[PDB]
């Protein structure tokens, strides 16, 4: 038996096999978890069904976190199939491209700010409410991904750095609120990894090349290592850890100035 024998986990935000969430899906399944999966939109449905089956899963649901009623239904639809759940993994984030390309002051407009924070920060609080019942059942847990662009400035990150800072404070507030029920809320801050949201971004190459040089382990981290770190926080080995941001970035955050 694996560490999560006969446990249930919903995984929000699986678009491709390069995803962080795919790396998280692998790891949990490896340790004998039973996965459910949400999809954002009808175009993604067939691919998420293929990914679901790859993890021996037939529990797929449409959930666009921009809509309230999709969040409510997607967990009311899950409540039919499962009478409880051990963890929900939030691995969602978005910003309009125009707010990510350039200098923060000019391109950061109201509507792009409003979306960044809605999808990337409020979805997690929305999802935490719509899960609270099925989580209370098994004293389950929450996991989200964040980026250190929130604590310190990173080129081009811009309005995401704010929406990610909102989300990390939001982790600590969910943790205190849901603590009394036995639910743990945690996040991982991942180093840069090549996925869909990095597709063809030219900054990303140089920026990964910089992260590789600056980091203490002299390499960029893998979706495998983010998967294993997530698993730990989704497991009973992390029962004393709530409210935590776990940096999985080779120790890049700890470096103030690199020799060359």
């Amino acid at each position: 038996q694996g560490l999560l024998a006969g446990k249930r986990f919903l995984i929000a935000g699986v678009a491709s096999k390069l995803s962080i969430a795919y790396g998280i899906a692998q790891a949990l399944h490896r340790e004998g978890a039973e996965l459910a999966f949400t999809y954002p939109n009808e175009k993604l449905k067939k691919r998420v069904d293929e990914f679901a089956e790859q993890f021996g899963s037939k529990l797929v649901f449409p959930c666009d976190v921009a809509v309230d009623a999709e969040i409510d239904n997607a967990f009311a639809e899950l409540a039919k199939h499962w009478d409880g759940v051990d963890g929900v993994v939030h691995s969602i984030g978005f910003a309009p491209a125009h707010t990510l390309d350039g200098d923060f002051t000019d391109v950061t407009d109201r509507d792009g700010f409003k979306i960044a924070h809605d999808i990337s920060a409020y979805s997690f609080v929305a999802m935490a409410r719509a899960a609270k019942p099925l989580l209370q059942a098994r004293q389950g847990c929450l996991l989200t991904l964040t980026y250190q662009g929130s604590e310190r400035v990173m080129p081009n990150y811009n309005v995401m750095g704010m929406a990610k800072a909102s989300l990390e404070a939001g982790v600590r507030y969910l943790a205190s609120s849901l603590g009394v029920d036995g639910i743990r809320v945690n996040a991982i801050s991942a180093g840069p990894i090549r996925t869909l949201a990095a597709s063809g971004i030219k900054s990303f190459r140089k920026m990964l090349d910089a992260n590789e040089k600056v980091a203490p382990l002299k390499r960029n981290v893998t979706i495998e290592e983010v998967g294993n770190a997530a698993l730990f926080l989704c497991s009973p080995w992390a029962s004393g850890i709530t409210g935590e941001i776990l940096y999985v970035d080779a120790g890049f955050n700890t470096v103030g100035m690199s020799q060359s």
Copy 2:
């Protein structure tokens, strides 16, 4: 001839004689600065006109930071009068009443999140964009107010924690964007202060009494030490300080666990 002699400062967020905005206006004036002012809406037009008079000022303009026209217009209006400005002081913050009262997961709703972040965080960026031409002239600087509820959970603060965390990251993103022009960007993390944004609230009472016991100096902060600290971060004595979050809370944030 005080420290700020023949300098100009727009002060955004004066609603009463209790306000941190008021305290800041007092000490900047007390050092010989030419203040301009803004007011949210028509109902607060007279009271601010009255508070404007007090500091030799007649440069009062309408600014609801919810609307994009009103932000840009009021920064043209001022550009007729002034051809330069040494500082802008953001001191605006709002969240709907039901978001600041209950269980975080239970009470915190999509629009309440949108609104809180929109007024309490994006307004700062929007004002920095609008204020950018004038500040370029004098190589001036920005200042906003934040609360350590972002960094560590406080009771009944909830989504404002998420909104302040977003604002504080914003301060750093601005610090880097506008730093090429000598424009500084800082914030003050004020202890709790009975100002207008706590009246009718019986929790805030208990909150000030706790703060007095935990704080090292064993006393709350009113608005004149927050005012004098804003004076400092707005003076040429802080020419080397940008992107800072200065804690004006008589040490509260350093205490891990206070005796009883």
Copy 3:
């Protein structure tokens, strides 16, 4: 197999069955690890022989970290039995009772300060150096314990706060130095736990009680939960992690102010 099958770990700082290093050992053996052990003075030896016998181990050595030869010695003595080690686990700390018993200014003399930083902080840098040859073979990994009394004031803790601050800086620096050799350095900020360090102290309970009231999971943490976190940080599941301070304190570090 267990996760740590065919892996070797040294455990420095086993005093009693209340100890954290004791708890750590139980976790590591439970997943198939072959432990070594150390003892500081002659009076401890047989108790450490007996704890080592409980984990199927006759690798028990003298290592008083006050003495350089005794640190240099044991890692030559270990070098006979093992060609390569998968990690040292530093779990040593000390301060003269009189320094942890009163007002910080009144009681913090030069020798107290000297011992505190020598045993609790410096030692980790020495035992990193002594252990580096055996660590490079299997790309092993270090791990010390710390208390959040470094980052915020806890009453009585006093000089150990400055020692732990030094130690946590010790971690980030070693992590950069030894990263090049593939080595991971990490710490755990454990919540307060009743162990032989507190045995005689009245005020520690009132401190343990406070933690339970403030912490979001409303409970203290066990040497098991610390132990299980230390297993994860010593494994291939934490290969993407170095320089981290992982809080295992049921989320006490996230709360600025708790209901009552």
Copy 4:
């Protein structure tokens, strides 16, 4: 008059006209402070009398911070002239050369650890204790200098980072220990400036080049910009500010990764 109208201030650690101590003293004298100085060893005495002459001071005393006797005497010898005192500025920092030149794990020996901590971290505590009676009288304040080597890795800083972290904790433990006598205790974390610590070192030249590139204000900071921030923390404008590490580094600390 200026801000510090007939206040008294002690300045430990003026080495030359390039020192921060000197630069602070200057800015403190500008606002009407009567200054007293100390010197370390018999060589520096004339130079420190020569400098103390520049600012109106014949109050100059011998104080090697390695020795307890000269601390208790220096504050007994000051107590003759001055009945009370308004602040003590601690600009003392020292580590061996060998410890600040190489790989961290190799060059850090027990004695170099003990010197770096004992001088750069304990000296600040020891002086606060001797200076209590005089400080208590005028409800005076303490200031110290630190480097963000404590919080993140800057190359070749090595064991000093452990001492600056140790120090930065002591600022908090002293802020809460001496807080009940209305004594404020703060530190300035200063950007890199060329001083007598930098003289002879060649890495320093390169480290300022990068710090200028990275820092949002595109410039290093001046002893006058550190002077005027110290002034603020030693003044009545900072009465709500204790236990603070104020960054005066052109916002370098706020940058995760600079473009280029």
